[PDB]
Amino acid sequence: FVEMVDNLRGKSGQGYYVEMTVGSPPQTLNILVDTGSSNFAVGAAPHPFLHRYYQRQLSSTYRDLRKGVYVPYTQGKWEGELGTDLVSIPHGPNVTVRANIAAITESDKFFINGSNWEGILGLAYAEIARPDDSLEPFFDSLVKQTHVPNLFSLQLCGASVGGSMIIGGIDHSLYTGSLWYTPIRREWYYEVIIVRVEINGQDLKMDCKEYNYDKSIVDSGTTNLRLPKKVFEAAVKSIKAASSTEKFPDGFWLGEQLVCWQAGTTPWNIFPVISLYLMGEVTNQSFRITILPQQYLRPVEDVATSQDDCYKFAISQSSTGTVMGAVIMEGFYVVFDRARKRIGFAVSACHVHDEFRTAAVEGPFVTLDMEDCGYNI
Template identity: 35%
Template structure:
C-alpha cells in the first residue's frame, strides 16, 4: 500500500500477489492481510470502474467490493479467464482486432502480444502493448480514419500529445478495439472497446481558447513489461478477481463506456494457452536464473560427464591407445566464440 505525501489519500492499494511485494516478499499485500484478518480461506474482490463523473468533473468514480467466503455474487459466468501465473494477474490474450481485422499476421503472433506477459492491472491507466503490436494497432487505426474520411491530425495517436478542439467530440466514430482472452485451452471470449474507451478527455489550461482536450489511452511498452490491460480497458465492466478459483470473471457493468462482451468462441485446432503464452519461469525473479545460471549449470554437467568417461577409459588397459586419443582431445583448451 503506497500513499504519496499530500496526495489526499490517493495511492496504490496492494491487490496483487505477495510475490511482487516491495521491498521484499515478506511484506504481506493488503488483500492477503484482509483475508488473514477475517480468517477466510475463500476470497475475491470486484472492481467496477466508471470513468470521469462528467465532462466538467475530472474525478473518477467506481465501486470496489471485497467478497469473503462462498458468495452468490460469484456467478461463474462463461466470461472467465484463468490466472496462469500468480504474481500480477497474468492471463493469456489470443488476439487483438481493430474493426474486426486481426493484428496477428505472419510477422506478429499471439505470443508477441503476450511477450513477456499479459496482465490485468487497475494500477495502470492505459492499454499498454509491446512495440510491434502497438505499431500495428496504431497503423490500423490510422488507416481506418483515412478510409472513413475522419478529420484527425496524424499526431493525434501520439500519446504524449494532447489534442484540443473547440467543441465536444464523439469518439464513437472510431472503430472497436477487440481483445480476445483465453478462457481455457480451446475457447475464448472477446472484450469490445469502443472509441470512448481509448480516447479520454483531459483538462487543458484554463487560459486555453480550446475547451475540449483529449489524449489517446494506448501506449507502447518500454523494456519487457509486455501487455497491460489498464483501467481504461476495465471501464464499463465489472471485473471479479477470484483468488480462490484463480480466475478473473467479466460481467457488463452499470456505468462507463458502452463496451461489449461476447463469446464463447472455440478453436479446436490448437491449445490456445500453450500456443500464445510467452515462455516464462514460475517465479518472479526466475529470469536471472534462466539467463545466467542455466548455461553455467549445463556446461558444468557436460564437463563432469566427460571427466567420468575419461577416467573410465583410462582404466581400461585394453584400450590404451584410444583412451590416449580421447585424453589428448579432452585437454584441448576450450575456445569461446564471440557471436557479436
C-alpha cells in the same frame, strides 16, 4: 454488498482510491487501489502534496519491524519503514486485520500534486512485494485473519470518477449479461493471456506471443491500454486506416499532443472498437472483450491554453508487456477470483457509450494453440 457500492472516488488521470483506517485510534486515509503492485504503503511524513499522513506515534497498536524498504519503479520511487498495525476499510467488510504497512518517509514522483490520496494498496501477490515475498500483502492478511472470501471485484466508472470495490464477493447489479473468466496464468501480477486482437472485427493476424511479450496484466494503477511495441504499431496502423476519413498528426497517436473538437460533436463513429480475445476456462475456448473509443480517447480537462473538447489517445507502446489499465477496466466489471485463479469480465453497468455501440463481453469462441500465446524466458 450494498454498503461497498460507490466506495471508490477519484479524478481523471489520478486513479481510484478507497477510504481506509490505520492504527488505534483509527487514522483515516485515502488509498489508491492498485492491482499492479503488492505493498500497502502510506505517506508517513508531511509532504506538501498530502492532505494527511500516518502518524505512528499516535497508534497504540503500531509495531515496528525495524526494517527499511527501498522501492524504485518505472515512473518514480518511494522509500520507507516497515511495521504492522490494525487496518480496516470503513466501506468494506466489517473487520479489522493486522497488516504490514510501509511508512513512506521519502519519495519522488510517487504522490501527485492535487490528488486526494495519501497511500497505495497493492492488491497483487507476494511474489512482487517489496522487499521480498515474505512481506505478506494486505489482501492475503485480510483473508487469512477473517472469513472474508478470497476474491474482490472492481467497477471503475470514468472531473470526478467513481466506482465500487466489492471485497469478498460480487454485486450483480454492477454488470449486465454474464461474467466470462480467463485464467490467472501465474500469481504475481494479475497475469493473463491475450489470444487474439481485432480492430473493428479485423484480426491483426500477429503471432499471439507478440500480444503477451513478455506478459499481459490487469492493472487498475495504470491509465492506458499499453501494448508491446510491435503490437502497438500494428494496432495504430489499423486504427489509422479505420479512422482515415479524418487525419491527425503523428504526435497524437504517440500521445505527444492532443486533438480537439467542437463541444458535443466528437465523431465517435469514425473510431473503431478494439477487441481482445482472452484465454477461456476450457481447452480451445476463448471469449472477447470489446472497448469503444469512449474508453481509449480520454478527455483532458486542465488544458488552460485551449477552449474546446480535447482528448488524449490513451493507447501506448510498452516494453513491459500488455497492460490492461483503466482504458480496459472502465468498460467492465472485473472479478479478481483469487480462490479459483481466474479473472472475470462482464459489461459494466456504468461504462460510457453511445446510442449505436456498447462495450461487450462475448463468447464462447473456438481458438486453438492458446498455450503457445504465453511468453516464457
